């Protein structure tokens, strides 16, 4: 709340 998003 919020993000950390597009994998590895």
């Amino acid at each position: 709340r919020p993000s950390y998003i597009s994998h590895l």
Partner: antibody, heavy 121, light 108 residues
Framework: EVQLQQSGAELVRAGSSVKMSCKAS????????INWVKQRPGQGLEWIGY????????KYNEKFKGKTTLTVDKSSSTAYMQLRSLTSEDSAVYFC??????????????WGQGTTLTVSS | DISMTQGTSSLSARLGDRVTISCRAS??????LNWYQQKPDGTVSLLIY???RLHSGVPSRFSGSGSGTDYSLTISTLEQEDIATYFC?????????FGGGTKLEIKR
């Protein structure tokens, strides 16, 4: 456009081994991890393990380590899963799935149709 | 490991009902919970991820909530295509684990 096409059904005798594939497309193969899930008609789903195409790093579920080996081919965007010393306990459908990073950890956003393995003579 | 349990194995409901599928972790998973929908045939897709609240591109009628050890998926206004099997999955510790699943079926 994110697609994961897995191998075709498999037929193998006990004591033998098998290697299935999961071809990815529509995204950057090395930017996401691949997980493998096991589904026997009874139980639910079991997490086998995970691999990072980028570095080849692999983490296994203790129960499945020893008989399972996850590999990957960066030149064809394909992840492979080899099962050894097969028994009827290995008869199930196997899925590969992509992982994505939100907050602290991961989740599987895309899955393949699955690969059916039947161990018998 | 962290055991995930879904009290109901099969659940009955009529189209248009507000459906609730539960799931409980054996320990606190800090909202690291995901929901997947498996079909009789086209088989598997993600609906909600993280603490059961984030969407993915699925209809708004799918909502998720929970915290600590108890979480749930609510399908407001159930539709025909929604008839399927639902699995929860904790992403807090390793190995990753799923609940036994919950298969919805039509009341008659």
């Amino acid at each position: 456009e994110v697609q994961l096409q897995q191998s075709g059904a498999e037929l193998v005798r006990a004591g033998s081994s098998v290697k299935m594939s999961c071809k990815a497309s529509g995204y950057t193969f090395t930017s996401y991890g691949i997980n493998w899930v096991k589904q026997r008609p009874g139980q639910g789903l079991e997490w086998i393990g995970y691999i990072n195409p980028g570095n080849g790093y692999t983490k296994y579920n203790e129960k499945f380590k020893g008989k399972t080996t996850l590999t990957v081919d960066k030149s064809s965007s394909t992840a492979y899963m080899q099962l050894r010393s097969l028994t009827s306990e290995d008869s199930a459908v196997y899925f590969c799935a992509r992982s994505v990073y939100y907050g602290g950890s991961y989740y599987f956003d895309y899955w393949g149709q699955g690969t059916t393995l039947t161990v018998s003579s | 490991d962290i055991s995930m349990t879904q009290g109901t194995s099969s659940l009955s409901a009529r189209l248009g009902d507000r459906v609730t599928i539960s799931c409980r972790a054996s320990q606190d998973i800090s909202n690291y919970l995901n929901w997947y929908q498996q079909k009789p045939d086209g088989t598997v897709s993600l609906l909600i991820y993280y603490g059961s609240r984030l969407h993915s591109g699925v209809p708004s009628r799918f909502s998720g909530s929970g915290s600590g050890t108890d979480y749930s998926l609510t399908i407001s206004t159930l539709e025909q295509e929604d008839i399927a099997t639902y699995f929860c999955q904790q992403g807090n510790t390793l190995p990753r684990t799923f609940g036994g699943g919950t298969k919805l079926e039509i009341k008659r």
